[PDB]
């Protein structure tokens with residue numbers, strides 16, 4: 341049908357508090373941008389813990405994807421950086437709610453008072469996802485939860501939209517965070533750069549983290565980072 345598209349029912353606005361949170365995060369972390377990756381990996385780890393917990397009581401939990409991993413790949417020619425986990429994933433409703441709406445009050449005070457380090461505060465609380473906007477002009481979240489069809493969440497920070505993924509169920513289960521890198525954040529397309537950061541931020545992750553890398557004549561394959 342053409343109703344959903346004709347009435348733009350796929351477009352949403354961010355909650356005021358979220359807009360404020362995004363600015364705070366982007367303003368206070370301007371000097372420590374690389375931490376966006378640590379945060380995305382941390383979120384992936386959490387999603388992996390959730391499905392792991394679900395599998396405990398639900399025997400069919402891991403059906404869509406038996407592995408529990410975090411895989412990262414740089415697409416230098418597309419100017420894209422991908423962080424994929426085979427965690428619990430998110431349903432269409434969760435994409436809207438979990439990423440578009442938000443201890444909120446105290447955090448706003450704590451962050452402001454911390455600006456006027458905050459790297460640890462972003463981690464303690466769970467709003468590190470937004471640090472991605474420090475290096476990306478657009479952030480895309482493709483997700484597949486056991487109880488819904490694969491969906492795509494996209495945003496340039498001025499609004500966000502969620503749509504059914506026309507590519508179908510390609511993830512099996514999990515989430516891929518896709519960053520359309522800012523022109524100045526081109527270094528995150530470099531394998532070694534990503535490797536140094538990934539290896540430096542996966543040391544405390546109990547799940548295996550891989551980076552799609554090359555070896556030498558030149559062959560590509562997943563390389564374990566932790």
Ligand SMILES: CCNC(=O)[C@H]1O[C@@H](n2cnc3c(N)ncnc32)[C@H](O)[C@@H]1O
Pocket residue numbers: 383384387425427428429430438439442466467468469470515
């Ligand atoms: C304030 C930003 N919102 C989130 O990071 C929330 O969104 C969802 N989320 C973010 N990244 C992932 C992920 N990789 N897998 C599953 N849920 C996620 C979780 O519910 C998080 O608590």
